[PDB]
Write a protein that binds this ligand. Structure first.
Ligand SMILES: Cc1cc2nc3c(=O)[nH]c(=O)nc-3n(C[C@H](O)[C@H](O)[C@H](O)COP(=O)(O)OP(=O)(O)OC[C@H]3O[C@@H](n4cnc5c(N)ncnc54)[C@H](O)[C@@H]3O)c2cc1C
Ligand SMILES: Cc1cc2nc3c(=O)[nH]c(=O)nc-3n(C[C@H](O)[C@H](O)[C@H](O)COP(=O)(O)OP(=O)(O)OC[C@H]3O[C@@H](n4cnc5c(N)ncnc54)[C@H](O)[C@@H]3O)c2cc1C
Ligand SMILES: Cc1cc2nc3c(=O)[nH]c(=O)nc-3n(C[C@H](O)[C@H](O)[C@H](O)COP(=O)(O)OP(=O)(O)OC[C@H]3O[C@@H](n4cnc5c(N)ncnc54)[C@H](O)[C@@H]3O)c2cc1C
Ligand SMILES: COc1cnc(OC)n2nc(NS(=O)(=O)c3c(OCC(F)F)cccc3C(F)(F)F)nc12
Ligand SMILES: COc1cnc(OC)n2nc(NS(=O)(=O)c3c(OCC(F)F)cccc3C(F)(F)F)nc12
Ligand SMILES: C/C(NCc1cnc(C)nc1N)=C(/S)CCOP(=O)([O-])OP(=O)([O-])O
Ligand SMILES: C/C(NCc1cnc(C)nc1N)=C(/S)CCOP(=O)([O-])OP(=O)([O-])O
Ligand SMILES: [K+]
Ligand SMILES: [K+]
Ligand SMILES: [Mg+2]
Ligand SMILES: [Mg+2]
Lengths: 601, 601, 219
C-alpha cells in the first residue's frame, strides 16, 4: 500500500513528447523559444497548438537562445529553449556560453538522433553533451522515457539554484517518440517543492568590522537582483550605516542612481569618482559581485586602503557570495559570507550600527563626484549628433511615460555610453551581455524581454556592427507581436575596436569598417516602422516619434565617428589610474588621426 | 656549424602576429575570412593592409566559417578563418562541426585572452579548446611565440591529410603581442615539403573479385574529388570494365551524368533506378564514400545480392577508403583498400579485365532508368510554378554560358530538388551541407566559392527558411565584390519538415511556418539587384535576367506549397522499398490535407 | 547501486568529500531517495519469433554461450532446456565456463584462441549460431572477416545466421552483424524463445561430424 503511494501511473500511455509537455506545465513555463527539425519532431507534435504556453519562433537558433536569455533576465524565470539535433543544437552554443558567464538561468532542450544511431556519425548528429560541457552548469542525455521527468526536474533545479546558469538536456528521437509503459517514482513527476553556525559567526564578525569602518563603500552586482527583496535590503543597509553605493554593469538598477549616496558604475569605463572611492575605502562590502577583470583594474594594485585596514584589523573586504568557486578566486575576502546575499543581509543589518553622519568621508565623495562627471565634447554648429547626447535624450524622454522601461544593448561603445548616461532606478532594467560580451545580443534579448514584460517599453540600444550580426530577427519580433524599440547608433564603424586601434596601434584601422545596409529600407522589408535621425535639429522630435510608436520600430541615428569612451582605465593599470576627457586632447587626437590616415578618418 | 644550419634566426624580432602573417604566405594562403576583436588585435595589426592575401569580412563569424567552407570545397585549398576570443570563437562552432561531418579542410585561428588571465572566467574567455574538441580533427593552444610556426604547420598538415577536416589553433593575446627572442628549428619555419604490401595484396584480391562480377556497380562519393585525377580514373575504370555509376549527394559532379552509364544519385531521395541497382548488384565498388545512413537505407537489408556473392566467393563490397575509422564501420567490406582512392585506382585498373558488353545487366539497368524517372506533378493552367520545373529551367539556361557553374544550397526540399534536377558534369560544382545539414549554409558558402572562383557563375539555390538564417551576409557579398546569384524558392514554409508532418503527423504543422520579409525590398536595402518571379509566364525571362546579371542578384520565385520530394525511402526501410510519385495519390493527399486543416493548407 | 547492477553490470565510483561526510543533515529529503529499488517490447517480441523460425530451419546449429547467461539464476537451466529441446551442441567462452555441464555429450568445451579445435571447427561450419550473453571478443572470433563462414552464407540464403541475445545495445552489431538481435536479459528472452522452437529428436549427420571432431581434437 505504501509502494502504491510512492509510485505514479498517471504518465503511462503518454509519449516522451507528451510527458515533456506536461512537465513544462508543472514547472510553470509560460514561454518557449525554439525551432523545429527531424530529431525533435515528436516533441513538436506533442506541443502542437498548445494553449498552455506561448511559443516564439526566431529565424535562427542563436536568436532563440538570446531571446530566452532576455526573457530570463527580465522575468527572473528560467528561459526555455527547444531545438533539433546537430546544427540546431550547435547554434545555441554561443547563447549557452553567454548565459554561463552572466549567470542566466537557461534550460536548453535539444533533439538528438535515435539512440540506435548515436556514435555512428549519423545524419545531423553532433556530440552536444561533449561540446556544451564547458558552457553549461550541467548537461545530460536522456536514455529512456522513464527517466525523462526526473531529468527535467534536475535541469530546472540546477539552472535556478546557486549561481543561476544554463543547462542542456539531450533528447533522442526514439526516446521522445517512445511510450511510457511503467510506473515511476511519484517525486520525479513533481518539481520542488537554516543558516550554518559557521556562516552566522562570519556574519557577526563582518558586522563588527563594518562597525569600525570610517570609509565604507558598497560594491553591488547582479547577485542582489536574484531576490525581489534584494534592492530593498541594499537600500536599508546603505541608509542605516550611511554608505555610498557603486554597482557593476550587471548591477545597474539595483540602486536608485538619483540618491545622493549613488557613486554610479565602477570599472574600466565607470565613473572616476566610483573608482577613486573604492581605491580609498577602508571597508568594501561586496554584494553579489565577482571581482571581474573589467572592474578591479590591476589586481595587485586594487583596493589598497581596504587591504591595509584588514592588516590593521579595522576594515577589509566583506564578500557576500552564493558560489564557493567565486569566493577568494580573485581577491582575498576578510570575511566570506556564503549563501544568498539577500537572506544573509537580513541577518547582517540588525547587527550593524546605525550611523547619522560621515562628514569627512562624504566630503571627499561629494568632491570626487563634482570633479569627475561623465564629460565629453558637446555638439558644435553643423556637427553630427554626439552619441552621449543621444543616450541622454532617450533616457530623459523615456522616463516620462507611465510604463516600466527596459534597456537591452549590443556590445561596444554604444553599450558603455548607455550604461553611463541612462539614469538607472529599477531592478532588471539593464539587460546586456557582460561576461562573454556577445555582439548581436541586443535585438533578440529585447524580443525576449518584451515577451516577458508585454506592458513595458523595451529599448535595444545597439551598434551598427552588432545589429548586423542578428538583424534577421526583426521578422521574429513582428511575428511574435513584440513592439520592441531598436535604436541603432550608426557610426559606420566597429567603434570599440577603432578606439583601441587609435590608442595602441597608431590609427591603423585593420578591417574594422563593415558596410551597412540601408536601415530604413531594411525596416520596411521586415514590416517594421523606420525612423532616421541625421542632424541635431531632428534629435528631439525623432526620439519622441520613436518612443510614441505602438508597433515594432527601428530608429537609425547618424552619430559622430571616432569618439572614445571616457573615462578609461587601460588594461594593466590601477583602478584610479584613469584617462579623463579633455577638449584640447581630443582636438589634438583628431588632427593626428587626420594626418596619419591622409584625411580618410 | 651543423647546429647553425638546423636553427633559424630569421623570425627573431618579429611579433607573434607578424610571424602568423609570414607563415600564411609560406602556406600559400591567398584568402582569409575573419572578424576582429580585443584578443586577436595583435594579429589584425600585423596583417594591416597586407597585399599578400585577400581579407573577407562577413557580418557574423558563422558567416566567415561557412564562407571558408565554400572556399575550400570550390578550390581544394584549406579555408582559413581568423576570429577573436569568446563569442567570436563560439560563433564558429557550427561551421567547424559542419566541416568535420563533410570532410572540409578548415583552419580556424581564434584569439584567446592573455595567458595571465586564462582560467579566471576572464573578459570574453571561452574554453574553445574544450568546446571544439568534438568538432575538430585536432586543436591546440599556443603557449609561447617560439612554438607558433610549428603549430601552424601542424594545423595545415592535419587539416589537409587523411580525410580532410577542421582544426583550431588558439592564440593568446600576450603570445601574439610578444616578440620572438630566440632561434627556432628551421624545419618549423617551413611547410611540407610507397604502397604497403598488405594493401597491394588487397588490391590484387579486389581485382580478381571484380573480374568475376556479372552485375557490378560503382558507388562513388566525395573522396574521389580530393584528387584532380579522381574523376578521370573513375571514368577509366567504368569504361574499361563497363560498369554503371551512382554517386552520393557529395559525389555529384564526379561522373558525367550525360553518360549512359550514369545511374544518378542514390539514397533516401535518390533515383529508384540507382537504389534498385545497388540492391541487386553482385559487386559494389565503393570509391571515397562512407555508407552514411541517408544512403544505405535499412542497414540489415542493404545490398543483399553483394553479401550473397561475397559468401559464395563471386563478389562483394570493395571499399577504397583513406580513413581506417570508416572502414568496416557500417558495413563489412569484402576487401578494404586503405589510402587515397585515386592513387589506389592507378594500381587497381591495370589488374581489371577489359569488358565489351554486359547485355543482361545493362538491359535491367536501362529498364530501371526508363521506369524510374524523377516524375512529379507538372504545372496546370493558373497553378503556381512547380519547384522541380524551376530547377530544370535554371539548369538548362546556366549550361549555355561559357563559364564554369558552381551550385551551393541551403537545407531542405529545395536542396534535394537541386540535387535531382540539375545535370551534374564537373567536379566540385555541388557545394552543399550534407552530414550536419546546416540551414543558412547556402549564401555564405556561395560567397566563399565565388571568391575562390572569380570567373565562375555561382548559384545559391536556397529555401526561404534557410535564407532567413543568414541573410545579413548579403552586405558581405557586395563588400567583397562577389557577384553571387541567390535564388530563393519561396514556398513560405519549412517544406522538408512539413513533408514529414504531412506524412507522419496527420498534417499537424507545428511551428513550421515562419514569416518572410519582402525579399525585393531586402535586396534593395542590401544594395543587391532584385528579381521576383510570381507566375509561369515569367519563369523563362526571369531566370535569364537572373543569369545575365553581372552583379550580386537575389531572385525570389513563388513556388507550389506542400509538395513532397519523391522518390523517398522512409527511415527504417530497405533501399528498394521506396515511395514513388503518383498523380492520383497526390490529388488525394491534397484533398485530405485541405479537409484536415479546414482549408488552411 | 542501480547502475552497477543493471544492464551489463559494471563498476561505478562515488566520490565523498571529507566535509560532506562529516557534515550533519539538517533538512528533510524525498522519501524515495532513502529507499533502494524496489514488459517485452513488440519490437523484441517480433525479433524473437523471427529468430525461432530461423532456428527451426537450421541443420547445423550451435550455441555460443558466455558470461551473460550467468547473470540470472535460471540462466544455465534455460540454456540446458534449449539445447535439449532442439538438440544443439554447446560451446562457451572462458567467462562462460560452468554455464553448461561439460560432462554432457553435447558439450563442445571452450572456443577461441586456446579453446578446443573441435569447438572452433564446429562454429566455423555451423549454419546457425545462437549467441547467449557473449560479446564476440577478439580472443574468441579469430580473424573477423573469416569468422563463421557457413552462418553468413546461411543468412544470405535465408536458412540460418547469427541470433544474438544481448542486454547492451552497444555490443549488438559491434563486431559481427546479427541476423536477428534480441535485446534484453538473455534468460528472460529465452523463456519466450524456447516455446517457439521446434523439438528435435536427432541430428545424425551434424552430430556425426561433431563426435568425429571431438575424437580427433582432444587437449
Ligand atoms: C565592452 C565591455 C566593457 C565592460 N566594462 C565594464 C565596466 O567598466 N564596469 C563593469 O562593472 N562591468 C564592465 N563590463 C562587464 C564585465 O565584464 C562583467 O560582466 C560585469 O562587471 C559583471 O558584473 P557582476 O559581478 O555584478 O555580475 P556577475 O558576473 O553575474 O557576478 C555575480 C556574482 O554574484 C554571485 N551571485 C549570484 N547570485 C547570488 C545570490 N543570490 N547571492 C549571492 N551571490 C550571488 C554570482 O555567483 C557571481 O559571483 C564590460 C563588458 C563589456 C562587453
Ligand atoms: C535533407 C538531406 C537529405 C539527404 N539525402 C541524401 C540522399 O538521398 N543521398 C545521398 O547520397 N546523400 C543524402 N544526404 C547527404 C548525406 O547525409 C551525406 O552527407 C552524404 O551521403 C555523404 O556522401 P559521401 O559519403 O560521398 O561524402 P563524405 O561524407 O564526405 O564521405 C567521404 C568518404 O570518403 C573518404 N575519403 C575522403 N577522402 C578520400 C580519399 N582521398 N581517398 C579515399 N577516401 C577518401 C572519407 O574519409 C569518407 O569516408 C542528405 C542530406 C540532407 C541535408
Ligand atoms: C591469456 C588469455 C587468453 C584468453 N583466451 C581466450 C579463449 O581462448 N577463449 C575465450 O573464450 N576467452 C579467452 N580469453 C578471455 C577473453 O578475452 C574474454 O574475456 C572472454 O572471451 C569474454 O567472454 P564473454 O563474452 O562470455 O564475457 P563478457 O566479456 O563479460 O561479455 C558478456 C556479454 O554478455 C552481455 N550480457 C551481460 N549480461 C547479460 C544478460 N543478463 N543478458 C544478456 N546479455 C548479457 C554483456 O553485455 C556482454 O556483451 C582469454 C583471456 C586471457 C587473459
Ligand atoms: C533527410 O532526412 C530527414 C529529413 N527531414 C526530416 O524531418 C523534417 N527527417 N527526420 C528524420 N528522422 S530519422 O530518419 O529517423 C534520423 C536518422 O534515421 C536513422 C534511421 F532510422 F534511418 C538518423 C539520424 C537522425 C535522424 C533525425 F535526426 F533526422 F531524426 N530524418 C529526416
Ligand atoms: C572592454 O575591454 C575591451 C574592449 N575593447 C577591446 O579591444 C577592441 N579590448 N581589448 C582588451 N584586451 S585585454 O584587456 O588585455 C583582455 C583582458 O585584460 C586582462 C588585464 F590585462 F586587464 C582579459 C581578458 C580578455 C582581454 C581581451 F580579450 F579583450 F583582449 N580588452 C578590451
Ligand atoms: C568587433 C567588436 N568586438 C569583438 C566581438 C566580435 N564578435 C562578437 C560576436 N562579439 C564581439 N564582442 C566590437 S565591440 C565592435 C562593436 O561595433 P558596434 O556594434 O558598431 O558598436 P560601437 O561602434 O558603438 O562600438
Ligand atoms: C527546419 C529544417 N531542418 C532542421 C534544421 C534546423 N536548424 C538548422 C540550423 N538546420 C536544420 N537542418 C528544415 S530542413 C526547413 C527548411 O526549410 P526551407 O529552408 O524553406 O527549405 P524547403 O522549404 O525547400 O524545405
Ligand atoms: K548613470
Ligand atoms: K540529375
Ligand atoms: Mg558602430
Ligand atoms: Mg521553404
Amino acid at each position: 500500500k505504501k509502494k502504491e503511494q510512492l509510485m505514479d501511473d498517471s504518465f503511462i500511455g503518454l509519449t516522451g513528447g507528451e510527458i515533456f509537455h506536461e512537465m513544462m506545465l508543472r514547472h510553470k513555463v509560460d514561454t518557449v523559444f525554439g525551432y523545429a527539425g527531424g530529431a525533435i519532431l515528436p516533441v513538436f507534435d506533442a506541443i502542437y497548438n498548445s494553449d498552455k504556453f506561448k511559443f516564439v519562433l526566431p529565424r535562427h537558433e542563436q536568436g532563440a537562445g538570446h531571446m530566452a536569455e532576455g526573457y530570463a533576465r527580465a522575468s527572473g524565470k528560467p528561459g526555455v529553449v527547444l531545438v533539433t539535433s546537430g546544427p540546431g543544437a550547435t547554434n545555441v552554443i554561443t547563447p549557452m556560453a553567454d548565459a554561463l558567464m552572466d549567470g542566466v538561468p537557461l534550460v536548453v532542450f535539444s533533439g538528438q538522433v535515435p539512440t540506435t544511431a548515436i556514435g555512428t556519425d549519423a545524419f545531423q548528429e553532433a556530440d552536444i553533451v561533449g561540446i556544451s560541457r564547458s558552457c553549461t552548469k550541467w548537461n545530460v542525455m536522456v536514455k529512456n522515457v522513464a527517466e525523462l521527468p526526473r531529468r527535467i526536474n534536475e535541469a530546472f533545479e540546477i539552472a535556478t539554484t546557486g549561481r543561476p546558469g544554463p543547462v542542456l538536456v539531450d533528447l533522442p528521437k526514439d526516446v521522445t517518440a517512445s511510450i511510457l509503459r511503467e510506473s515511476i517514482p511519484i517525486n520525479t513527476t513533481l518539481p520542488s517543492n537554516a543558516v550554518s553556525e559557521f556562516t552566522s559567526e562570519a556574519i557577526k564578525r563582518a558586522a563588527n568590522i563594518l562597525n569600525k569602518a570610517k570609509k565604507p563603500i558598497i560594491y553591488a552586482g547582479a547577485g542582489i537582483l536574484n531576490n525581489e527583496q534584494g534592492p530593498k535590503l541594499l537600500k536599508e543597509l546603505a541608509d542605516k550605516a550611511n554608505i555610498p553605493v557603486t554597482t557593476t554593469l550587471q548591477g545597474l538598477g539595483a540602486f536608485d542612481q538619483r540618491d545622493p549616496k549613488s557613486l554610479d558604475m565602477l570599472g574600466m569605463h565607470g565613473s572616476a569618482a566610483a573608482n577613486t572611492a573604492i581605491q580609498n575605502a577602508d571597508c568594501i562590502i561586496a554584494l553579489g559581485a565577482r571581482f571581474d577583470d573589467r572592474v578591479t583594474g590591476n589586481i595587485s594594485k586594487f583596493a589598497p586602503e581596504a587591504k591595509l585596514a584588514a592588516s590593521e584589523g579595522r576594515g577589509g573586504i566583506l564578500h557576500f557570495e552564493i558560489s564557493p568557486k567565486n569566493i577568494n578566486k580573485v581577491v582575498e575576502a576578510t570575511e566570506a559570507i556564503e549563501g544568498d546575499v539577500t537572506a544573509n543581509l537580513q541577518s547582517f543589518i540588525p547587527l550593524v550600527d546605525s550611523i547619522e553622519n560621515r562628514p569627512e568621508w562624504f566630503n571627499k565623495i561629494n568632491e570626487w563626484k563634482k570633479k569627475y562627471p561623465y564629460s565629453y565634447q558637446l555638439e558644435t554648429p553643423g556637427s553630427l549628433i554626439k552619441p552621449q547626447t543621444l543616450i541622454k535624450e532617450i533616457s530623459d524622454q523615456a522616463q516620462t511615460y507611465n510604463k516600466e522601461v527596459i534597456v537591452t544593448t549590443g556590445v561596444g561603445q554604444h553599450q558603455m555610453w548607455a550604461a553611463q548616461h541612462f539614469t538607472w532606478t529599477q531592478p532588471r532594467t539593464m539587460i546586456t551581455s557582460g561576461g562573454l560580451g556577445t555582439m548581436g545580443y541586443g535585438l533578440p534579448a529585447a524580443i525576449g524581454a518584451q515577451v516577458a514584460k508585454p506592458d513595458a517599453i523595451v529599448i535595444d540600444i545597439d551598434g551598427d556592427a552588432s545589429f548586423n550580426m542578428t538583424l534577421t530577427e526583426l521578422s521574429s519580433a513582428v511575428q511574435a507581436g513584440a513592439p520592441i524599440k531598436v535604436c541603432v547608433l550608426n557610426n559606420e564603424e566597429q567603434g570599440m575596436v577603432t578606439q583601441w586601434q587609435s590608442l595602441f596601434y597608431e590609427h591603423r584601422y585593420s578591417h574594422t569598417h563593415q558596410s551597412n545596409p540601408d536601415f530604413m529600407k531594411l525596416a520596411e522589408s521586415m514590416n517594421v516602422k523606420g525612423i532616421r535621425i541625421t542632424n541635431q535639429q531632428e534629435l528631439k522630435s525623432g526620439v519622441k516619434e520613436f518612443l510614441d510608436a505602438t508597433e515594432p520600430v527601428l530608429l537609425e541615428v547618424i552619430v559622430e565617428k571616432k569618439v572614445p569612451v571616457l573615462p578609461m582605465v587601460p588594461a594593466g593599470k590601477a583602478l584610479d589610474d584613469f584617462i579623463l576627457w579633455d577638449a584640447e586632447v581630443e582636438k589634438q587626437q583628431n588632427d593626428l588621426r587626420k594626418e596619419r590616415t591622409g584625411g580618410k578618418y
